[PDB]
Design a protein around this ligand. Sequence first.
Ligand code: CMC
Lengths: 5, 214
Amino acid sequence: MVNAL
Amino acid sequence: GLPSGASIVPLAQEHIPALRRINSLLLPVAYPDSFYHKALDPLASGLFSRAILWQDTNADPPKVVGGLICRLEPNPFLSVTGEPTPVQLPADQPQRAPQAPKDTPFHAIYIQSLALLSPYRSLGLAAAALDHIIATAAVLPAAGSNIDARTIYAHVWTENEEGLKWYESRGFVKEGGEPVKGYYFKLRPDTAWIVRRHIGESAKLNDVVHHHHH
Ligand SMILES: *C(=O)CSCCNC(=O)CCNC(=O)[C@H](O)C(C)(C)COP(=O)(O)OP(=O)(O)OC[C@H]1O[C@@H](n2cnc3c(N)ncnc32)[C@H](O)[C@@H]1OP(=O)(O)O
């Protein structure tokens, strides 16, 4: 799960 | 062998609404629409991304039950001559990917999102999607690609034991000795492990872990 950047 | 009714395909526009719903149900980071548009761009996240489809009966159109959205990047785990190296995590840029060496010839595949609805779990579907990605990376050079994907990696929230267990079972290792602080903007805790698996011509390095970083 990548961050929302 | 895939269970009857399952298929794995390159992620396409028709799968996005459903995969976005699945991610919204299973991953506690809200992604903006741009994330899903980039997942369709072969130059952004539109090469290694995969949909996991299910048909209950042969009369049903296959429906999305899970997927992996992935992005190609310069490889941040290897030197420009292929040695395993500790990762570089600039302290002012924790929400950014680990920094790769300038002008490296090696690539990494970054898994941005992984999700599978619970009725379809424990059937090897996500593992099969991962294997399809790895096999795609292996055959791309023979097809004339300049992509040399030597590692697959992801961030895993430190509270997500389900995900951590899956990545460990697939041969990934935690890299850097500690999770990334301040990785997530709104989630509490905001920490995430970097997990990585070396593949292809670098697969022999998979067991070489650095328990520190730069
Ligand atoms: C950022 O997005 C990265 S971190 C976020 C990860 N996602 C997440 O947490 C969302 C919610 N959870 C899930 O979606 C789900 O729990 C997964 C996708 C993380 C894992 O789902 P599964 O556990 O069902 O994983 P699969 O790979 O689909 O199945 C693996 C298990 O299936 C059995 N099996 C049967 N044949 C197999 C073959 N050929 N190869 C491997 N495994 C096979 C096994 O029982 C296997 O169990 P393991 O314990 O080996 O995983």
